[PDB]
Structures are given as structure tokens and as C-alpha cells.
Amino acid sequence: RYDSLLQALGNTPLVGLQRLSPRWDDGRDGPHVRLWAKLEDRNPTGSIKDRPAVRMIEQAEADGLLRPGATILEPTSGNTGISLAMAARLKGYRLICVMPENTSVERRQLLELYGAQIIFAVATAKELAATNPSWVMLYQYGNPANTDSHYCGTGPELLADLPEITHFVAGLGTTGTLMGTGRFLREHVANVKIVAAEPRVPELYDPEILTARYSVGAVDAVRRTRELVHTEGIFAGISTGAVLHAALGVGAGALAAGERADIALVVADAGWKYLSTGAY
Amino acid sequence: ARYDSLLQALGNTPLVGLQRLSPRWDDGRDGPHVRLWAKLEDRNPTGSIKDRPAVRMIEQAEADGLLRPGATILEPTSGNTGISLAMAARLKGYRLICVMPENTSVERRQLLELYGAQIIFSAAEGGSNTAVATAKELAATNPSWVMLYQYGNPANTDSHYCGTGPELLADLPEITHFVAGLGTTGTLMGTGRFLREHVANVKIVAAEPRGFVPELYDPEILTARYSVGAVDAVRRTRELVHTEGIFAGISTGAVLHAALGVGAGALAAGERADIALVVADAGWKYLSTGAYAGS
Ligand SMILES: O=C(Nc1ccc(Cl)cc1)Nc1cccc(C(=O)O)c1
Ligand SMILES: O=C(Nc1ccc(Cl)cc1)Nc1cccc(C(=O)O)c1
Numbered sequence: 001r002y003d004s005l006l007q008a009l010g011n012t013p014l015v016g017l018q019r020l021s022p023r024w025d026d027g028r029d030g031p032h033v034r035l036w037a038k039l040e041d042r043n044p045t046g047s048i049k050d051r052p053a054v055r056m057i058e059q060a061e062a063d064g065l066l067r068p069g070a071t072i073l074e075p076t077s078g079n080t081g082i083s084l085a086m087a088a089r090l091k092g093y094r095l096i097c098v099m100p101e102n103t104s105v106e107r108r109q110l111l112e113l114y115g116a117q118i119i120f121a122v123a124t125a126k127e128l129a130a131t132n133p134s135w136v137m138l139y140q141y142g143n144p145a146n147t148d149s150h151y152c153g154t155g156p157e158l159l160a161d162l163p164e165i166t167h168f169v170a171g172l173g174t175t176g177t178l179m180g181t182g183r184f185l186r187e188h189v190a191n192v193k194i195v196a197a198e199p200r201v202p203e204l205y206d207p208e209i210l211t212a213r214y215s216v217g218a219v220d221a222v223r224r225t226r227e228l229v230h231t232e233g234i235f236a237g238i239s240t241g242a243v244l245h246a247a248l249g250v251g252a253g254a255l256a257a258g259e260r261a262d263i264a265l266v267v268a269d270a271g272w273k274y275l276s277t278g279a280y
Numbered sequence: 281a282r283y284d285s286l287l288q289a290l291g292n293t294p295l296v297g298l299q300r301l302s303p304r305w306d307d308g309r310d311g312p313h314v315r316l317w318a319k320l321e322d323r324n325p326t327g328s329i330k331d332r333p334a335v336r337m338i339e340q341a342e343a344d345g346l347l348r349p350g351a352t353i354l355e356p357t358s359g360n361t362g363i364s365l366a367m368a369a370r371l372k373g374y375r376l377i378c379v380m381p382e383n384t385s386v387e388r389r390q391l392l393e394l395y396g397a398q399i400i401f402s403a404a405e406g407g408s409n410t411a412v413a414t415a416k417e418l419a420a421t422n423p424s425w426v427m428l429y430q431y432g433n434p435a436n437t438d439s440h441y442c443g444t445g446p447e448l449l450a451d452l453p454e455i456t457h458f459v460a461g462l463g464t465t466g467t468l469m470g471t472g473r474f475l476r477e478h479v480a481n482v483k484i485v486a487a488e489p490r491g492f493v494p495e496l497y498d499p500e501i502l503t504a505r506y507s508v509g510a511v512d513a514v515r516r517t518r519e520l521v522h523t524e525g526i527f528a529g530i531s532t533g534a535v536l537h538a539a540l541g542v543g544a545g546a547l548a549a550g551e552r553a554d555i556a557l558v559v560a561d562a563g564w565k566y567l568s569t570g571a572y573a574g575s
């Protein structure tokens with residue numbers, strides 16, 4: 001049990017995708033190639049961003065950067081603003097999110113609910129931070145706590161749950177997830193593969209870490225997100241569909257080469273915020 | 281840990297102490313503590329507590345020979361159990377006919393359609409009654425459909441007796457009260473039957489909105505029953521998010537409404553309380569209602 005919602009965070013579960021695995025069972029035909037999904041929507045605000053959000057805030061506090069009633073500013077496409085708005089409400093901070101205007105109405109709603117101001121990005125936010133030195137910009141694209149959250153959280157859990165891992169597949173945005181989990185897995189798992197997925201450069205980016213990076217188009221991502229609810233029951237968000245596409249690429253390849261694989265892939269969020277788009 | 285299917289990634293939901301909201305979190309010197317504890321059943325396969333009964337029901341139906349691959353399932357529901365059964369039916373390869381009232385939220389037809397269940401939108405005029413009556417009439421045209429019947433299937437109650445309850449006693453052995461909504465009654469009947477078997481003085485408190493009585497209902501399991509209006513349930517729900525950061529469905533506000541009533545009681549009598557309450561779902565599929573906007 002937890003004294004706070006901020007604690008009921010991480011230790012997200014890992015689910016084998018039996019029906020979507022290129023080959024779930026070792027057989028006459030060749031060794032298994034398994035997709036395992038990690039459900040990061042099982043977090044305080046329903047996305048993986050709770051990890052860095054909280055770790056960044058607890059980090060600014062512990063530094064003494066943050067103080068009662070301080071204004072926090074963050075450029076975000078949704079998920080991180082939501083995680084920061086929830087944490088800021090519990091801690092007595094005022095959040096301002098700078099967002100692109102093409103973000104889903106669900107984001108806006110939940111942010112308003114949590115007491116966040118929304119400006120309608122990194123550049124704008126940077127300029128505002130400079131206009132108002134009072135305000136604190138945690139800066140998820142450069143903040144080491146972002147990467148540490150995954151190095152110290154997502155990584156170890158994955159490894160504890162899937163010690164036989166061969167690939168890790170995730171989305172590449174601020175890059176924290178792939179860098180932190182990537183750096184952890186690479187530092188512990190000989191010959192591990194770290195795969196990115198991008199839509200067709202942050203200070204957190206480390207060129208050394210990725211083994212592959214797939215570019216995935218919008219239509220493939222949507223397609224795959226639907227396939228995932230159809231086949232495995234998981235009401236994933238759009239990013240997860242692109243992640244799944246790349247994972248299946250990597251799956252086809254291991255299956256082609258006669259090699260075993262245990263592909264761990266991230267489900268960064270659920271479909272809830274994406275329904276207004278009509279992609280479901 | 282590691283699961284081989286989404287159906288196993290079910291339950292063992294977190295219990296989080298609500299310090300800001302509890303009438304008195306700390307056990308000090310104006311009195312003993314009055315402490316609220318929230319069980320987060322949104323941390324479940326389809327973001328609802330119904331995953332528990334929906335899976336057990338199917339699995340019980342399978343063991344008993346009542347279901348076979350290709351079988352169509354029929355069920356009346358207000359959303360949560362429909363969605364849960366739609367998920368399981370993708371994985372076990374069954375078809376799904378839901379009967380849902382027409383005045384339910386937008387995002388629950390969207391989601392139900394997404395898993396590819398048929399939805400017959402029964403009339404708003406008599407709510408659940410109308411939806412259950414409607415499913416029973418349907419169950420009668422085609423008896424090859426298997427209606428699990430959440431309102432009378434002890435596998436509903438069983439899922440909470442074997443899951444929700446044990447989990448709750450483990451995490452909160454000092455428990456004095458349990459507070460959940462009253463619909464099918466499985467949550468209160470199963471969690472209640474378990475807890476009363478193990479915790480001496482335990483209070484089992486229901487919440488309901490201000491028609492029939494489900495077959496599962498045993499009123500000897502209940503201590504008390506609160507009616508809650510939607511205006512109270514909304515304002516309570518908005519309070520939970522603002523003060524604990526939990527984004528729950530409107531049902532949880534009414535449970536919270538009940539729980540605070542209970543808590544305020546213990547507080548004024550000067551007695552200790554450890555009040556567990558179910559957050560049965562998250563706020564996702566309620567945003568379209570406008571309940572989270574600005575009063
Ligand atoms: O990077 C993604 N999503 C994403 C989408 C598609 C693909 Cl292929 C990979 C990642 N989201 C993201 C990135 C950086 C910040 C935030 C944010 O919540 O502000 C979200
Ligand atoms: O009982 C509720 N919700 C509820 C709402 C308000 C209050 Cl106060 C108590 C319960 N929901 C319910 C009941 C029975 C079946 C289903 C279902 O998902 O099919 C849902």
C-alpha cells in the first residue's frame with residue numbers, strides 16, 4: 001500500500017503476446033520468437049510519463065530549485081503535461097503547458113481538470129522561461145531525471161520479468177525511455193538489441209545506444225493499434241502501434257534467421273485520449 | 281511480474297492511502313485516525329473492476345460446458361461489463377451481443393464497437409430494467425446465445441470472494457469499513473462475505489443512485505445502504521482528483537460520498553476507522569458528459 005498516488009507508480013506488468021508472436025512455442029520448425037508487452041498505461045495518469053514527471057519534480061525539489069507555489073513550465077504534446085499537472089496539484093505548484101494546437105481534446109480536458117493552464121512549442125516555452133526566471137522549466141528533453149527514471153525503473157523491472165530478453169522496442173520522442181532502459185539493458189545484457197520507432201534532437205539523445213531506428217508512417221501505426229486490440233485485447237494508444245510494427249519487423253527477421261527472440265515492447269499509453277481522433 | 285495473456289494481468293490492484301481527503305490521517309491527539317483507503321480497479325485489463333467477474337464468468341461457463349469456440353455471448357450492461365466481455369471474447373474467439381441503454385456515454389459505444397461487439401441500444405425509459413428485460417427477450421429468440429447474466433451468476437460474487445477480498449485484507453488488515461457501489465451486488469456480496477469471515481467488527485456499506493433486485497443480492501451481508509445523487513457524486517469525483525490526483529469515474533464519487541459520511545461519523549464519535557473504498561473505474565469514458573469541466 002501507498003501513502004500517495006505518486007507512489008503507486010511503475011512495477012507495470014509484462015504480458016506475452018501469444019497470438020501476435022511470430023512463433024510462441026519452440027518446435028520442430030525452429031525456436032520461439034516472442035513479443036512481450038509492458039503496460040505503462042497502468043500508471044498514475046495512464047501513461048509512461050508519470051515516471052520522468054515525478055522523478056523530475058522530486059529532483060528539482062531535492063535540489064531546492066522548486067519551492068511552495070512556484071510556477072512550472074513544460075513543453076509537451078500531452079502525456080507529460082498530464083503527469084506534471086497531477087503531481088503539481090498534489091504538491092502545490094502551478095503548471096503551464098505549452099502544447100501544439102493539433103492535440104486531442106481529451107488531453108486538454110484532463111489538463112484543465114488538473115488545474116493546468118494551456119498556451120498553444122519547445123521554442124515558445126524556452127522563450128517564456130527566459131521571460132520569467134521565477135518559473136521552473138524541468139525540460140523533459142534535456143533533464144537527466146527523465147533518463148534516470150527509466151534507467152532506475154523501467155529497465156530493471158523489464159530485466160527482472162524477462163531476463164531472457166533479446167530486444168527492447170520503444171518510441172523515440174524525448175528519448176528518455178530508450179536511452180535509460182537502453183543504457184541499463186546494454187550495461188547488463190550482453191548483445192541486447194535496442195530498437196526505436198519514430199514518426200515518418202533533444203539533449204538527452206545518446207547516438208551510441210540504439211541498435212536500430214525504424215521510421216513508421218501514421219497509417220501503419222493506426223492499423224497496428226487496431227490489430228493489437230483485435231488480437232491481444234490491449235486498447236493501446238497510437239505510439240504503441242508503431243512500436244508494435246517495428247517489433248514485428250524484428251520478429252519477422254528472427255523468425256527468418258531461425259533464431260530465438262524475446263522482444264520486449266512498450267505500451268506507452270491506452271487508447272482513451274485518442275478516441276476523439278476517430279482512429280478506433 | 282510476468283503474464284502469458286492479458287486475462288492474467290488482472291487484479292492485485294493497488295491500495296493507496298488518501299491523506300489529504302481522510303477526515304483525519306494521523307493517529308494523534310484530538311482523536312484516533314479516520315483513514316480512507318482506495319482500491320484502484322482501473323488498474324485492470326479494460327480499466328474497470330468488471331474484468332474480475334467478466335473473466336471468471338466466462339471461465340466458469342467454459343468449465344461447465346456452456347461455452348464453446350464460435351459461441352455468441354449475450355449480455356445486458358451499462359458499459360463496463362460489456363467492454364470486459366468484449367476483450368475476453370477477442371482472446372477466446374467468441375462473438376458478443378451487448379444490450380446497453382441508449383443514454384450511456386459516447387466513449388463506451390466507441391470502445392465496445394472497437395472490440396467488435398454488437399450493441400443493441402435499449403430505451404432510456406426504464407434503465408437497467410429495460411436493458412435486462414430486453415436481453416431476456418433476446419435470450420429467448422435464440423437460445424444458442426449464452427447469457428452469462430451478471431446479475432445472478434455467483435461467478436460474479438466469486439471473483440470478489442477469491443480476489444478483491446483477500447487482496448484487501450492482506451493490504452489493510454486493520455480494516456473497519458468497506459465501501460463500494462451496489463449494482464449487480466457481486467462486489468459487496470463477495471468482498472463482504474470474505475471480510476465478515478475474517479474481520480470481526482467489519483462494516484459493509486453500499487452506495488446506490490438516488491426496478492428489480494438482482495439474484496445475487498444477500499442483504500444480510502450489508503450493514504448500511506446510502507442513496508447518492510449524481511450532483512453529489514460528481515462534486516465528490518472532482519474532489520478526489522483535485523486532492524489526491526486520482527481521475528475516477530462518477531461511481532467512485534458516490535462511493536466517496538458514502539465513505540466520507542461514514543468517516544465523519546467515526547470522527548465525531550471519537551473512534552478509529554480504516555475505510556477501504558473501491559475506485560471501480562477511471563474518468564476516461566465519462567469526460568464527454570461534461571462532469572469534469574467547471575461545475
Ligand atoms: O514521442 C511521442 N510519441 C511517439 C509517437 C509516435 C512514435 Cl512512432 C513514437 C513516439 N510522444 C511524446 C514525445 C515527447 C513528449 C511527449 C509529451 O508527453 O509531451 C510525448
Ligand atoms: O452499478 C453501477 N454503477 C453505479 C453507479 C452509481 C452508484 Cl451510486 C453505484 C453503482 N454499474 C453497473 C451495475 C451493473 C452492471 C454494470 C455493467 O457494467 O454492466 C454496471
Ligand SMILES: *Cc1c(COP(=O)(O)O)cnc(C)c1O
Pocket residue numbers: 047048049079080171172173174175176177178237239240268269
Ligand atoms: C513520451 C512518449 C513516448 C516516447 O518516449 P520518450 O521517453 O519520450 O522517447 C511514446 N509514446 C507515448 C504515448 C509517450 O507519451
Ligand SMILES: *Cc1c(COP(=O)(O)O)cnc(C)c1O
Pocket residue numbers: 328329330360361461462463464465466467468529531532560561
Ligand atoms: C459494476 C460497477 C459498480 C458496482 O459494482 P457491482 O459489483 O456490480 O455491484 C460500480 N461502479 C462501476 C463503475 C461499475 O462498473
